[PDB]
């Protein structure tokens, strides 16, 4: 049968599903690992033992145990990112959408959800892969991985909680694709991994890791890069946060073994309840348990790997959204609200930059402040608001990504950069938030093609060209089918705008601010902090 | 006789001179101190001992011994600033222009020339005071003071070379005015001191120094203020440069006494030929012998006095020119030429910032560079030229002055700020230089009123309103003539921070003169360099 597939670990039965007055095959909740429960908590994933009989793959799997956002109850803007299935530690599964009829060795795209490494689910409505797999004729896979302490508690030296297991979960799903995608009509040789934010940073990390390099052909990074300030920690910081987590739960701290044993006895929700208490500063856009630079998954520091060219050489397509920081200001900075224009006073501004650049000393805060304040109108609440918004986005997403793109292009085989700046006409968030972090996703997945979602015809057109750019790039390493999307080069540094208007080519995306964040501030902090 | 005046030191005989179809009385080269020669070189000035007979005051006196610029031989643009009279150490004289018929108790304005404290002369053509004295009916006085090592060699502790003697020369000229100006029809109670650049810094220093405060009513500072990075040095730096001077002349450096004695036996030109070698680093807009914070002429640090309000509280009128730094880039930075557009390559821009900010460490240099570079277009030679121009002007003149104006206004009794940005039609310098340092002076002195000079009619009008603002301010403490139809120059207040543009176009009021850059220069950079 078309829905009955035999994989190297057993048989699986999919389901024919509707998609734009038609149908395609979908295999939901396929296990690619053994359930990480009990003694398995905090440990590297183990290949899923082969089962007999037919695995029912007609419904979405559980979502991993995670912090759940309750800020705005009932609000669709925030609720659309929360788990839409039961949460469980038994969550390592993948989903696959296959064109119907089943293609012959077609391009494979593997989605990696974001969520700051503390959240995310593969089953969200916006991650439904039926529109993209169908419209672009590609086999679309969405994997999952452990988040929060469950996937990143790091006690370097130990083998019970080595850290980065969430990345290893991802790597194993990729290994599973490499080994089984051919039975679904996919070409294990032409696999493209792509993800947004933590997903984008994850993609970048696999590009840098020797152990992941041969598990994919090309990469797409959306609003995230491996070198982001919030994307990783040192082994030492990882350890203190782990110890602090144990302290918060009255754990025995005499040894890694005792701490770990103690933590394995706690119910998932107990860990999660205190997760945020281990952060070293009052801050925004900073998450507790993230990847650690251990010398194993990552040979050396991320920077040295970028400089020496020690990473996978291939084609990459990446970009950022216009207003990456608004979401985090709304949730953690004083003066911001979802129901007002959020004019920011001078005082709140100062509090805001402190929260945005937690690691900075006073001279560093003055530099940031000076770089983003218009002293001919320092009491303009709109400028103060937009100024803060730029600080968070530049420092956390845009500039770290530009640093990555420039380093990568020295050795890469092709870079395509984009700047997504279209504010969806049906957004439920306030205007001041602008082009929000993560909202380019619905366009990549083709949600504007379903009429009941009330998108405009130009938005549906944009989505189609984005999907086509993404899929064409995945198939050939070039988003253009022989308005050309310029190749980003060390010399020209061209990039395109991604919106409803005709394609425009620009150069040096926010170069002034990125010189500040990538070269000046770091130098100032190393010489005075 | 209108030309025969008897002063507290003896009789003086002036001369009648032509001025715009009329006539005015002038007393040139009136001595106000004893000749600072021989054993008196480096010493505080001493009152001119009384003379008998009539002192012929019909010609300009000698100019003090100073470095002479020979960069462009024959070029009027630079030569107009060089000594136009023989140089001598015997140079403490003043000049006076008195309206005819002689006023009864009229306003007095005392000019203090600039020249980085290493040059200047009260006898230049641009300082001819007959036009302003005649046009605004004021008694105009131009004084002089020792410059270079002669006026600022400083060996703290010593009484032979105390330092700041050039500032003391100025004070003595002021004391002379206070005691004798009434004999020329001037009011000792209503004297206004004004000077440009080093002269501007001097004016602000007399406002700061307790011993100078009672010698004048108010002040005008043009393109210069006391807190400028080049206007003063610490006792230590002063001593180091004095010793380094002797070293350059193979002097006995065992004691200030011998060092001084050695230096006193050298010919003037000998000291001048080595003057520049004592500077700490390669730089632009830095001069060897300038005032020193001695705890005497200046009770404490300039910054502390400004914060405490420890200074003369009165009315001040001050301002700057749009392109203060071009002159100095031309003379000492690579890539600049008076015969080309002077487009600067990124390489020379970098060299330029180091020269311009000599005391800054690498981190400081990077902050300056980032602050004045448009990274979307870093090879645009024009943007680099203008960026460097702005750096020099902002660091050395504009921002130090804004710092001063804001501090002073917290305690002052009225502040008026201007931004001079008119490029003279007959300027011999290249256009890239814009509104050059010191070229607002010719407007202040009414040169545009003399037709053979070929200024435009609009420039004559600008000069007349500038002279009127200046004189009306000196007379009343307000540049504006009460209830008049003409636009009004608003008071600069700590809150609104208003100022006006001074050019041939109708007045425009603005706020926060270059706040962005001055926040960087006055607050951020100092903290960055102080860090470590
Ligand atoms: C798979 O499980 C779902 C229940 O979640 C059920 O409705 C469906 O019939 C099952 N498929 C088969 C044939 O077992
Ligand atoms: C990619 O590699 C091929 C093969 O060496 C080379 O010819 C091509 O120029 C490269 N493309 C880029 C943009 O680096
Ligand atoms: C004063 O000096 C001038 C300049 O030489 C001369 O013309 C004039 O006759 C002199 N007056 C007397 C009384 O000597
Ligand atoms: C100057 O001082 C007088 C009284 O001494 C005061 O009335 C006046 O308001 C002051 N002027 C300004 C502008 O500060
Ligand atoms: Cl549908
Ligand atoms: Cl004349």
Curated annotation (Swiss-Prot), chain A:
Pfam families: COesterase. One of its GO terms (cellular component) is extracellular space. SUPFAM superfamilies: alpha/beta-Hydrolases. Keywords: Cell membrane, Disulfide bond, Glycoprotein, GPI-anchor, Hydrolase, Lipoprotein, Membrane, Neurotransmitter degradation, Serine esterase, Signal, Synapse. An interchain disulfide bond is present in what becomes position 593 of the T isoform. Disulfide bonds join 64-91, 251-262, 399-514. GO terms for molecular function: acetylcholinesterase activity. Changing residue 197 to V: Loss of activity. Inhibited by substrate concentrations above 0.5 mM. Changing residue 197 to C: Loss of activity. Glycans are attached at residues 56, 413, 454, 526. Found in the synapses and to a lower extent in extrajunctional areas of muscle and nerve, and on erythrocyte membranes. Changing residue 196 to Q/D: Decrease in activity. It comes from the Eukaryota. It catalyses: acetylcholine + H2O = choline + acetate + H(+). The active site is at residues 197, 324, 437. GO terms for biological process: acetylcholine catabolic process in synaptic cleft; choline metabolic process. Its EC number is 3.1.1.7. Terminates signal transduction at the neuromuscular junction by rapid hydrolysis of the acetylcholine released into the synaptic cleft. May be involved in cell-cell interactions. Belongs to the type-B carboxylesterase/lipase family. Isoform H form is a homodimer; the asymmetric form is a disulfide-bonded oligomer composed of a collagenic subunit (Q) and a variable number of T catalytic subunits. This is Acetylcholinesterase. It comes from Tetronarce californica. The lineage of its organism: Eukaryota, Metazoa, Chordata, Craniata, Vertebrata. The gene is ache.
Swiss-Prot record, chain B:
Disulfide bonds join 64-91, 251-262, 399-518. Found in the synapses and to a lower extent in extrajunctional areas of muscle and nerve, and on erythrocyte membranes. The active site is at 197 (acyl-ester intermediate), 324 (charge relay system), 437 (charge relay system). GO terms for biological process: acetylcholine catabolic process in synaptic cleft; choline metabolic process. Belongs to the type-B carboxylesterase/lipase family. This is Acetylcholinesterase. Keywords: Cell membrane, Disulfide bond, Glycoprotein, GPI-anchor, Hydrolase, Lipoprotein, Membrane, Neurotransmitter degradation, Serine esterase, Signal, Synapse. One of its GO terms (molecular function) is acetylcholinesterase activity. Terminates signal transduction at the neuromuscular junction by rapid hydrolysis of the acetylcholine released into the synaptic cleft. May be involved in cell-cell interactions. It catalyses: acetylcholine + H2O = choline + acetate + H(+). It comes from the Eukaryota. An interchain disulfide bond is present in what becomes position 593 of the T isoform. Gene3D superfamilies: alpha/beta hydrolase.
């Amino acid at each position: 049968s078309e829905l009955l597939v035999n994989t190297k670990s057993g048989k699986v039965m999919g389901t024919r599903v509707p998609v734009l007055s038609s149908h395609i095959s979908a295999f939901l909740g396929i296990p690619f690992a053994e359930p990480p429960v009990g003694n398995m908590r905090f440990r590297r994933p183990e290949p899923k033992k082969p089962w007999s009989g037919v695995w029912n793959a007609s419904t979405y799997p559980n979502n991993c145990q995670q912090y759940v956002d309750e800020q705005f109850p009932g609000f669709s803007g925030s609720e659309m990112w929360n788990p839409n299935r039961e949460m469980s530690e038994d969550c390592l599964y993948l989903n696959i959408w296959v064109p119907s009829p089943r293609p012959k060795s077609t391009t494979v795209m593997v989605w990696i959800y974001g969520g700051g490494f503390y959240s995310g689910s593969s089953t969200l409505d916006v991650y439904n892969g039926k529109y993209l797999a169908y419209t672009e004729e590609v086999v679309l896979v969405s994997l999952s991985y452990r988040v929060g302490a469950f996937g990143f508690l790091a006690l370097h030296g130990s083998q019970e909680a080595p850290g980065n297991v969430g990345l290893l979960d991802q790597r194993m799903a990729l290994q599973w694709v490499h080994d089984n995608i051919q039975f679904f009509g996919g070409d294990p040789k032409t696999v493209t991994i792509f993800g947004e934010s933590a997903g984008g940073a994850s993609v970048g990390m696999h590009i840098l890791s020797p152990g992941s390099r041969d598990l994919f052909r090309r990469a797409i990074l959306q609003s995230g890069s491996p070198n982001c300030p919030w994307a990783s920690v040192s082994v030492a910081e990882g350890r203190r946060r782990a110890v602090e987590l144990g302290r918060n739960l009255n754990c025995n701290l005499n040894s890694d073994e005792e701490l770990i044993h103690c933590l394995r006895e706690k119910k998932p929700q107990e860990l999660i309840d205190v997760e945020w208490n281990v952060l070293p500063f009052d801050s925004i856009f900073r998450f507790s348990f993230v990847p650690v630079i251990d010398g194993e998954f990552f040979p050396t520091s991320l920077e040295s790997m970028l400089n020496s060219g020690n990473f996978k050489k291939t084609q990459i397509l990446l970009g950022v959204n216009k207003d990456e920081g608004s979401f985090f200001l709304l949730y953690g900075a004083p003066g911001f609200s979802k129901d007002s224009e959020s004019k920011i006073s001078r005082e709140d501004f100062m509090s805001g930059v402190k929260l945005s650049v937690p690691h900075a000393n006073d001279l560093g805060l003055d530099a940031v402040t000076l770089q983003y304040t218009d002293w001919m109108d320092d009491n303009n609440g709109i400028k103060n608001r937009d100024g803060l918004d730029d600080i968070v986005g530049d420092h956390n997403v845009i500039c770290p990504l530009m640093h990555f793109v420039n380093k990568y292009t020295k050795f890469g085989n092709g870079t395509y950069l984009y700047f997504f700046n279209h504010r969806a006409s049906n957004l439920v968030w306030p205007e001041w938030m602008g082009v929000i972090h993560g909202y380019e996703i619905e366009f990549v997945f083709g949600l504007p093609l379903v009429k009941e979602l009330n998108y405009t015809a130009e938005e549906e057109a944009l989505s189609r060209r984005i999907m086509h750019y993404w899929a064409t790039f995945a198939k050939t390493g070039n988003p253009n089918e022989p308005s050309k999307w310029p190749l980003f080069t060390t010399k020209e540094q061209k990039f395109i705008d991604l919106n409803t208007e005709p394609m425009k080519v620009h150069q040096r995306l926010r170069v002034q601010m990125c010189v500040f964040w990538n070269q000046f501030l770091p130098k100032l902090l190393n010489a005075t902090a």
